[PDB]
RNA sequence: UGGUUCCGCAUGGA
RNA sequence: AACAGUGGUAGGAGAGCGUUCUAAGGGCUGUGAAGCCAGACCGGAAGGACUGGUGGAGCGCUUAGAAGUGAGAAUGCCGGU
RNA sequence: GGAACGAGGUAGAUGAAGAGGUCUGGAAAGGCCCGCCAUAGGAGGUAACAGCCCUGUAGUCAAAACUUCGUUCUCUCCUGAGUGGAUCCUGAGUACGGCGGAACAAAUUCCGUCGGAAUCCGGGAGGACCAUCUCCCAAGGCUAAAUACUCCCUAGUGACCGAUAGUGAACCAGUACCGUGAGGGAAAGGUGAAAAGCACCCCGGAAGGGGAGUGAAAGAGAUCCUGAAACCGUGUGCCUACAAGUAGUCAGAGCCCGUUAACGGGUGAUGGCGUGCCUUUUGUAGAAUGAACCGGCGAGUUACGAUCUCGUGCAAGGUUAAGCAGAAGAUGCGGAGCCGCAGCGAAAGCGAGUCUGAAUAGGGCGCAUGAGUACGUGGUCGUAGACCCGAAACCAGGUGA
């Protein structure tokens, strides 16, 4: 705590107008002279692939944020789940699975 | 906080006020015409430490040109014939300095007319 | 890093931050700050509004200073994860110097500060030091007080800064189970 | 001006 | 270590010195501290240091964060002449 | 509508330990070598910087008389309801229409302005609003707490100011002055540890001096600590009465001096060169603008939002707010939120697929190739007085024949 010296290019001296001829800008100080609409986010295919795939626990795992209306399940990525929303390429690769 | 700052503006116009120590009238007490012959005397004492490099140039030459004309010869007539037959690289400074002793500067001035 | 304490694995490792280190510092002396400082100005000026333009303007001398420092407050917070990896840093210091030393119990009777100079005497601990008691043992908080080095801590209220300053520590060892639940 | 399953306030409509 | 290069306003970028303050240490002061006046010293600049007089209570230094700014110009404002 | 038991508030009481020894000084609270107290080394005085010198603090207890809160008693009071809706009730100039205002297609709010109703089968609303369905009962009236703010009054803290600052005002200040009046509105701190504040002598009418005394200091003698600069002087080394100069600068004898010892210091007869400073302009020597001089004061960064660079933590997961606990503190505890991991229409839908589109063809976008995010420093760009300084006018409330 005797020397507490900062990280090297941390900090920088704060830039001044007025304060000298030969510092710089001192004379003119450099100044010159629908209604509702559900939203089921992004639910990656390659996030579930890190684990009972519900949206209960989905939600606690940090896999979903947000909880709007209900959960839609993309095939983005390459692999019991209990949901509602399911795109076509999520379900044929859950079932190729 | 609040800085008053007094300590400050006088240490940095004494040390004007000491370099204008000889100058006339008020140029020497009041501050605010003490810095432009300040400001001035760094100014000509820059392009004055370049007329006296070359104005002993002019002082050298006129004297050589009296010492030559001893011998009838000129200052351009001397020196055309100092660097054809001798080789020396001499000062118009040097070759100068030695005017007083006529023998030395005699001795030099035989070699100008033997190679013209 | 057991041994023998004194009667009288991931705190306190390696690794040391640094960068972390000195800000978790940089934002423990502005809060101890307590800035109540104002000035008036050109408008809160008991002056005048006639043409004597204006009687307490910024180049009079009657008037108020053009900008100045107003009533603010600077309070600034790091992560969560920035606040807790970093006193065991400053611990970490002091378990290569042997700065850290172990007590059992803390072992009083009453308040007398005498006994605790002859506490410090049989530590042999000179300048400025810290009393780290997991119970709030009132014997020791209700001493020691008075003598002008040293200070007590309940070891839940430990900061990064005590341990900068006071630079050697006298920890009871049933505070040192305590400060890895919530560290 | 007029083409057109354009949408349509707990459930039907304009 | 050889070359190459160094006029410069607007303007852009970079490196520095100072002025008050509250603390981690470290240390001078009544055998005389700040401030003041001298000086024929030191540093590439801003600026530092040492002797001598005057003063009769305090100051300062590598180290970190903040700075009510560091003035020669306002038909500036108050005082003095 | 009363009476006891506690906590307070306004007065105080009590309170541990060194003349340590020695040095310098006018004077030890300093040094130097020692001792001691602490539930107490927070401050303030003491002839210099005190833990033990006092005034006090930590601690403990204290109020006759007031009041301020409560706990307890006195005291005071007083039905809850099983089934039936057979018959009555449930808030009338109102729920509502027309006309016109206002202020939150157009309700709405709310007034006038004339019309104007039924009512447990009921009644009301669910965007000028039409049919199903849920929720709830209009036109009776009262209601603490958690909040907003201080002229005040106690206790205290300031990376606050220290006499051109801080309030206008540290001082017999809203005073003195100015104005008929509403109103405007200053200047001005410091002897000494102590008043010991000059007995007496001398000149003078006295003021003011010189001696003498006091004092550590009279160079401290009443606008009195320190006392800078402009301005005014008196001495003294070197120059100056044939000389045309932004006053200086290089060369330079002579003459006088001795230094932070250094190719010294001060003057300089005479030769060379040399159109002040700042702002502004295509451009300066200008008569283009500004300054009598000295000293003081005097002009770009503050939380709120945008965007990029840098630093740092974690990293396809990062982050808490308010608030409650703890010296107005760090710190926990708080997972409500935000941001990101993927897209297109003036109006709707899947997901690596499109909006306009017979179209499996051209044009649209985006990935493939994937890092954000929480702070921090600086950069600009914003909103608010937003470099600082500086008009004429306009409105509201007032004062004057």
Do not use: C
Request: net charge positive.
């Amino acid at each position: 705590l005797h020397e507490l010296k900062p990280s090297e290019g941390s900090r920088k001296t704060r830039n001044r107008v007025g304060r000298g001829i030969g510092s710089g800008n001192g004379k003119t100080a450099g100044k010159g002279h629908n209604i509702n609409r559900k939203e089921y986010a992004v639910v990656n295919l390659d996030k579930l692939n890190g684990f009972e795939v519900t949206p209960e626990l989905l939600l606690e795992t940090g896999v979903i944020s947000k909880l709007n209306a209900g959960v839609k399940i993309l095939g983005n990525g390459k692999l019991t789940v209990k949901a509602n929303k399911f795109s076509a390429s999520a379900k044929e690769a859950v079932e190729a699975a | 906080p609040r800085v008053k700052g007094g300590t400050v503006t006088r240490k940095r116009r004494k040390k004007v006020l000491k370099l204008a120590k000889g100058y006339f009238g008020s140029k020497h007490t009041l501050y605010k015409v003490a810095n432009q012959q300040v400001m001035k005397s760094g100014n000509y004492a820059f392009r004055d430490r370049r007329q006296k490099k070359r104005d002993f140039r002019k002082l050298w030459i006129t004297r050589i040109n009296a010492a030559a004309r001893m011998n009838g010869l000129s200052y351009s007539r001397l020196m055309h014939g100092l660097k054809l037959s001798g080789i020396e690289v001499n000062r118009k400074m040097l070759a100068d300095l030695a005017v007083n002793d006529l023998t030395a500067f005699n001795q030099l001035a035989d070699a100008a007319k033997a190679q013209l | 890093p057991k041994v023998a304490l004194y009667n009288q694995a991931s705190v306190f490792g390696i690794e040391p931050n640094e960068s972390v280190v000195f800000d978790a510092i940089l934002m423990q002396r502005a809060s101890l700050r307590q800035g109540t400082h104002k000035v008036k100005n050109r408008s809160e000026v008991r002056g005048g509004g006639r043409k004597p333009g204006s009687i307490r303007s910024p180049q009079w001398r009657g008037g108020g200073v053009v900008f100045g420092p107003t009533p603010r407050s600077y309070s600034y917070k790091l992560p969560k994860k920035v606040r807790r990896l970093a006193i065991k840093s400053v611990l970490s210091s002091k378990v290569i110097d042997n700065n850290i030393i172990v007590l059992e119990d803390l072992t009083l009777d009453t308040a007398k500060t005498k006994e605790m100079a002859a506490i410090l005497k049989g530590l042999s601990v000179e300048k400025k030091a810290l009393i780290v008691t997991a119970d709030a043992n009132e014997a020791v908080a209700l001493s020691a007080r008075n003598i002008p080095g040293v200070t007590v801590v309940e070891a839940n209220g430990i900061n990064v800064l005590d341990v900068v300053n006071h630079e050697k520590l006298l920890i009871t060892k049933a505070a040192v189970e305590k400060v890895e639940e919530v560290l």
